Short mmCIF file of N, CA and C in Angstrom, two decimals:
data_model
loop_
_atom_site.label_atom_id
_atom_site.label_comp_id
_atom_site.label_asym_id
_atom_site.label_seq_id
_atom_site.Cartn_x
_atom_site.Cartn_y
_atom_site.Cartn_z
N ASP A 12 13.77 -3.85 8.16
CA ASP A 12 14.84 -3.45 7.66
C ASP A 12 14.69 -3.62 6.01
N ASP A 13 13.64 -3.42 5.34
CA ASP A 13 13.46 -3.64 4.15
C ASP A 13 14.25 -2.71 3.23
N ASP A 14 14.65 -1.61 3.70
CA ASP A 14 15.54 -0.48 2.94
C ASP A 14 16.84 -0.99 2.99
N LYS A 15 17.18 -2.11 3.70
CA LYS A 15 18.54 -2.84 3.50
C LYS A 15 18.60 -3.70 2.07
N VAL A 16 17.57 -4.11 1.70
CA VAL A 16 17.31 -4.97 0.59
C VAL A 16 16.77 -4.37 -0.70
N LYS A 17 15.91 -3.37 -0.43
CA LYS A 17 15.18 -2.73 -1.47
C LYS A 17 15.33 -1.29 -1.50
N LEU A 18 15.49 -0.60 -2.73
CA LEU A 18 15.84 0.79 -2.85
C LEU A 18 14.42 1.61 -2.69
N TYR A 19 14.66 2.44 -1.61
CA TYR A 19 13.43 3.37 -1.25
C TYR A 19 13.69 4.91 -1.56
N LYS A 20 12.82 5.64 -1.94
CA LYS A 20 12.90 7.15 -2.25
C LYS A 20 11.93 7.71 -1.41
N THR A 21 12.07 9.08 -1.38
CA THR A 21 11.18 9.91 -0.78
C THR A 21 10.60 10.84 -1.70
N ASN A 22 9.14 11.09 -1.74
CA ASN A 22 8.62 11.95 -2.54
C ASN A 22 8.23 13.26 -2.00
N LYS A 23 7.45 14.15 -2.63
CA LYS A 23 7.12 15.46 -2.05
C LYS A 23 6.05 15.38 -0.86
N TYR A 24 5.30 14.10 -0.63
CA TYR A 24 4.60 13.95 0.30
C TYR A 24 5.25 13.52 1.59
N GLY A 25 6.44 13.29 1.58
CA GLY A 25 7.35 12.48 2.57
C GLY A 25 6.98 11.19 2.58
N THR A 26 6.33 10.56 1.50
CA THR A 26 6.14 9.08 1.32
C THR A 26 7.28 8.54 1.00
N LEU A 27 7.70 7.37 1.72
CA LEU A 27 8.75 6.49 1.42
C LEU A 27 8.36 5.27 0.30
N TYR A 28 8.63 5.29 -0.71
CA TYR A 28 8.25 4.30 -1.80
C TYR A 28 9.37 3.42 -2.59
N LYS A 29 8.93 2.38 -2.90
CA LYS A 29 9.97 1.50 -3.85
C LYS A 29 9.01 0.92 -4.96
N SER A 30 9.81 0.75 -6.11
CA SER A 30 9.08 0.20 -7.38
C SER A 30 9.14 -1.29 -7.10
N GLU A 31 8.10 -1.95 -7.11
CA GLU A 31 7.78 -3.41 -6.99
C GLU A 31 6.45 -3.84 -7.49
N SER A 32 6.63 -4.74 -8.54
CA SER A 32 5.56 -5.21 -9.40
C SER A 32 5.13 -6.67 -8.93
N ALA A 33 4.21 -6.91 -8.02
CA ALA A 33 3.98 -8.25 -7.44
C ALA A 33 2.35 -8.35 -7.34
N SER A 34 2.01 -9.56 -6.75
CA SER A 34 0.45 -9.74 -6.77
C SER A 34 0.16 -9.61 -5.12
N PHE A 35 -1.16 -9.06 -4.84
CA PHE A 35 -1.47 -9.17 -3.50
C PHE A 35 -2.96 -9.68 -3.36
N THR A 36 -3.09 -10.62 -2.68
CA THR A 36 -4.36 -11.29 -2.37
C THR A 36 -4.95 -10.90 -1.10
N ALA A 37 -6.07 -10.11 -0.97
CA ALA A 37 -6.47 -9.79 0.32
C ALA A 37 -7.22 -10.94 1.11
N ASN A 38 -7.03 -10.88 2.42
CA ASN A 38 -7.70 -11.83 3.29
C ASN A 38 -8.92 -11.29 4.10
N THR A 39 -9.19 -10.00 3.58
CA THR A 39 -10.35 -9.37 4.15
C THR A 39 -10.67 -8.09 3.37
N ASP A 40 -11.81 -7.48 3.63
CA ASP A 40 -12.36 -6.49 2.82
C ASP A 40 -11.52 -5.16 3.27
N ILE A 41 -10.85 -4.67 2.21
CA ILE A 41 -10.09 -3.38 2.55
C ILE A 41 -10.49 -2.24 1.94
N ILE A 42 -10.54 -1.05 2.58
CA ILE A 42 -10.89 0.18 2.27
C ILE A 42 -9.72 1.00 1.46
N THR A 43 -10.01 1.37 -0.03
CA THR A 43 -8.93 1.87 -0.86
C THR A 43 -9.02 3.39 -0.93
N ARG A 44 -8.13 4.08 -1.31
CA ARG A 44 -8.00 5.53 -1.26
C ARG A 44 -7.79 6.03 -2.63
N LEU A 45 -8.15 7.32 -3.02
CA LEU A 45 -7.88 7.98 -4.26
C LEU A 45 -6.73 8.88 -3.92
N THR A 46 -6.11 9.24 -5.04
CA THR A 46 -5.00 10.21 -5.15
C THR A 46 -3.60 9.89 -4.33
N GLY A 47 -3.75 9.38 -3.16
CA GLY A 47 -2.59 9.20 -2.43
C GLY A 47 -2.73 8.19 -1.23
N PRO A 48 -1.67 7.73 -0.61
CA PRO A 48 -1.65 6.77 0.54
C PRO A 48 -2.03 7.55 1.88
N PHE A 49 -3.27 8.12 2.01
CA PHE A 49 -3.47 8.77 3.16
C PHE A 49 -5.12 8.53 3.60
N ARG A 50 -5.40 7.92 4.75
CA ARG A 50 -6.69 7.60 4.95
C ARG A 50 -7.74 8.88 4.82
N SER A 51 -7.15 10.09 4.91
CA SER A 51 -7.81 11.29 4.81
C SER A 51 -8.25 11.72 3.36
N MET A 52 -7.88 10.89 2.49
CA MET A 52 -8.02 10.99 1.10
C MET A 52 -9.48 10.42 0.79
N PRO A 53 -10.10 10.78 -0.38
CA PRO A 53 -11.61 10.35 -0.46
C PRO A 53 -11.40 8.80 -0.69
N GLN A 54 -12.59 8.12 -0.24
CA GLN A 54 -12.48 6.57 -0.35
C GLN A 54 -12.67 6.31 -1.96
N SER A 55 -11.94 5.35 -2.49
CA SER A 55 -11.95 4.84 -3.98
C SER A 55 -12.90 3.80 -3.97
N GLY A 56 -13.02 2.76 -3.00
CA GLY A 56 -13.82 1.54 -3.05
C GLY A 56 -13.55 0.59 -1.86
N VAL A 57 -13.59 -0.53 -2.15
CA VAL A 57 -13.19 -1.77 -1.38
C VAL A 57 -12.79 -2.89 -2.14
N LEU A 58 -11.56 -3.48 -1.69
CA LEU A 58 -11.05 -4.69 -2.51
C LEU A 58 -11.54 -5.68 -1.46
N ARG A 59 -12.41 -6.49 -2.22
CA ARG A 59 -13.10 -7.70 -1.50
C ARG A 59 -12.17 -8.80 -1.22
N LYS A 60 -12.38 -9.39 0.08
CA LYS A 60 -11.69 -10.46 0.48
C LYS A 60 -11.58 -11.57 -0.67
N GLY A 61 -10.27 -12.04 -0.74
CA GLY A 61 -10.02 -13.05 -1.82
C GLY A 61 -9.74 -12.75 -3.21
N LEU A 62 -9.85 -11.48 -3.57
CA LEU A 62 -9.57 -10.95 -4.75
C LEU A 62 -7.93 -10.62 -4.81
N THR A 63 -7.46 -10.79 -5.98
CA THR A 63 -6.00 -10.59 -6.19
C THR A 63 -5.80 -9.43 -7.15
N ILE A 64 -4.86 -8.46 -6.88
CA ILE A 64 -4.42 -7.23 -7.71
C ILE A 64 -3.17 -7.32 -8.02
N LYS A 65 -2.76 -6.61 -9.12
CA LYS A 65 -1.22 -6.52 -9.50
C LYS A 65 -0.98 -5.21 -9.19
N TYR A 66 0.08 -4.79 -8.12
CA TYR A 66 0.41 -3.61 -7.90
C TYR A 66 1.75 -3.32 -8.48
N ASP A 67 2.16 -2.12 -8.42
CA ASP A 67 3.66 -1.54 -8.97
C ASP A 67 4.26 -0.80 -8.18
N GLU A 68 3.74 -0.49 -7.02
CA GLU A 68 4.49 0.33 -6.11
C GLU A 68 4.01 0.03 -4.73
N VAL A 69 5.09 0.31 -3.82
CA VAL A 69 4.93 -0.05 -2.37
C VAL A 69 5.32 1.30 -1.67
N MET A 70 4.44 1.77 -0.79
CA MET A 70 4.54 2.96 0.12
C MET A 70 4.51 2.86 1.66
N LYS A 71 5.07 3.59 2.27
CA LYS A 71 5.00 3.78 3.78
C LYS A 71 4.66 5.28 4.05
N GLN A 72 3.44 5.46 4.56
CA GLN A 72 2.90 6.53 4.81
C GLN A 72 1.73 6.50 5.67
N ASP A 73 1.31 7.62 6.36
CA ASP A 73 0.14 7.58 7.22
C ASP A 73 0.10 6.24 8.10
N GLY A 74 0.98 5.92 8.84
CA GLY A 74 1.03 4.55 9.66
C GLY A 74 0.59 3.19 9.13
N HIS A 75 0.83 3.27 7.86
CA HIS A 75 0.65 1.90 7.12
C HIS A 75 1.61 1.66 5.79
N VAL A 76 1.48 0.53 5.57
CA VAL A 76 2.39 0.27 4.27
C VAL A 76 1.18 0.14 3.20
N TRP A 77 1.32 0.77 2.05
CA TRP A 77 0.12 0.81 0.86
C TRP A 77 0.96 0.11 -0.30
N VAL A 78 -0.03 -0.26 -1.29
CA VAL A 78 0.61 -0.66 -2.59
C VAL A 78 -0.32 0.09 -3.57
N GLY A 79 0.18 0.47 -4.65
CA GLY A 79 -0.59 1.36 -5.71
C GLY A 79 -0.79 0.42 -6.88
N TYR A 80 -2.03 0.48 -7.41
CA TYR A 80 -2.36 -0.26 -8.59
C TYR A 80 -3.40 0.47 -9.48
N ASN A 81 -3.63 0.08 -10.46
CA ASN A 81 -4.81 0.48 -11.46
C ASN A 81 -5.97 -0.36 -11.63
N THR A 82 -7.10 0.11 -11.45
CA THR A 82 -8.30 -0.84 -11.76
C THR A 82 -8.47 -0.87 -13.32
N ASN A 83 -9.53 -1.78 -13.74
CA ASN A 83 -9.87 -2.01 -15.02
C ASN A 83 -10.34 -0.73 -15.68
N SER A 84 -10.63 0.45 -14.98
CA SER A 84 -11.04 1.55 -15.52
C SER A 84 -9.99 2.56 -15.76
N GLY A 85 -8.65 2.08 -15.30
CA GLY A 85 -7.51 2.92 -15.27
C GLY A 85 -7.42 3.92 -14.00
N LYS A 86 -8.47 3.78 -13.07
CA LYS A 86 -8.21 4.63 -11.86
C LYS A 86 -7.22 4.16 -10.99
N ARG A 87 -6.40 5.03 -10.55
CA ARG A 87 -5.16 4.70 -9.56
C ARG A 87 -5.71 4.70 -8.23
N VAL A 88 -5.48 3.51 -7.52
CA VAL A 88 -5.94 3.26 -6.17
C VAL A 88 -4.73 2.92 -5.20
N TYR A 89 -4.87 3.40 -4.06
CA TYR A 89 -4.00 3.17 -2.98
C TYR A 89 -4.55 2.28 -1.89
N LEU A 90 -4.01 1.10 -1.79
CA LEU A 90 -4.41 0.13 -0.88
C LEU A 90 -3.55 -0.31 0.43
N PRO A 91 -4.09 -0.03 1.36
CA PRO A 91 -3.24 -0.23 2.71
C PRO A 91 -3.13 -1.75 2.87
N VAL A 92 -2.09 -2.25 3.15
CA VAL A 92 -1.91 -3.75 3.56
C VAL A 92 -1.49 -4.10 4.80
N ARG A 93 -0.90 -3.24 5.77
CA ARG A 93 -0.53 -3.58 7.05
C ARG A 93 -0.11 -2.38 7.76
N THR A 94 -0.15 -2.47 8.93
CA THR A 94 0.25 -1.20 9.90
C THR A 94 1.78 -0.90 9.87
N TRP A 95 2.17 0.29 9.93
CA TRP A 95 3.57 0.64 10.02
C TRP A 95 3.74 1.50 11.20
N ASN A 96 4.42 1.21 12.16
CA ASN A 96 4.78 2.14 13.30
C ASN A 96 5.86 2.92 12.83
N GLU A 97 5.48 4.16 12.57
CA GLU A 97 6.66 5.38 12.05
C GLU A 97 7.59 5.66 13.14
N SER A 98 7.10 5.34 14.31
CA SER A 98 8.08 5.54 15.48
C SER A 98 8.98 4.51 15.80
N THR A 99 8.86 3.28 15.22
CA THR A 99 9.66 2.03 15.68
C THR A 99 9.98 1.36 14.24
N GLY A 100 9.20 1.34 13.21
CA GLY A 100 9.49 0.70 12.08
C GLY A 100 8.73 -0.62 12.06
N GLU A 101 8.01 -0.85 13.29
CA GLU A 101 7.30 -2.09 13.41
C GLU A 101 6.16 -2.37 12.51
N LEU A 102 6.22 -3.38 11.89
CA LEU A 102 5.04 -3.70 10.89
C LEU A 102 3.97 -4.57 11.30
N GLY A 103 2.74 -4.40 11.09
CA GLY A 103 1.63 -5.32 11.58
C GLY A 103 1.56 -6.37 10.71
N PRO A 104 0.63 -7.37 10.97
CA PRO A 104 0.50 -8.60 10.08
C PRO A 104 -0.03 -8.09 8.82
N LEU A 105 0.43 -8.69 7.78
CA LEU A 105 -0.02 -8.46 6.24
C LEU A 105 -1.57 -8.84 6.23
N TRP A 106 -2.26 -7.86 5.64
CA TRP A 106 -3.78 -8.33 5.35
C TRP A 106 -4.09 -9.01 4.28
N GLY A 107 -3.22 -10.16 3.84
CA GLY A 107 -3.33 -10.95 2.84
C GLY A 107 -2.05 -11.66 2.40
N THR A 108 -1.88 -12.09 1.28
CA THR A 108 -0.69 -12.60 0.67
C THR A 108 -0.08 -12.12 -0.46
N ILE A 109 1.20 -11.88 -0.52
CA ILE A 109 1.91 -11.40 -1.68
C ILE A 109 2.74 -12.58 -2.38
N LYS A 110 2.81 -12.32 -3.75
CA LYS A 110 3.35 -13.68 -4.51
C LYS A 110 3.86 -12.80 -5.83
#
């Protein structure tokens, strides 16, 4: 029920998103995506376990919750951080820590 405490909007891709600037520290090697929060998008790279990134957006799309951030080169990356059951709203365990 995060939409009860945070403002969410919907974009042209049908993605539910909220503006949020925090830090995410991965507890596993995560595959990132380019252009948007879809596993069908080209792979951007891999966020290694233990690394921390600062994101500015949180999105719900393609069965996961994702965070958006920019790398040191300015490349926009979409990082999946947990599963999201679109048919129930059920969220899987966070694949790291948020602060």
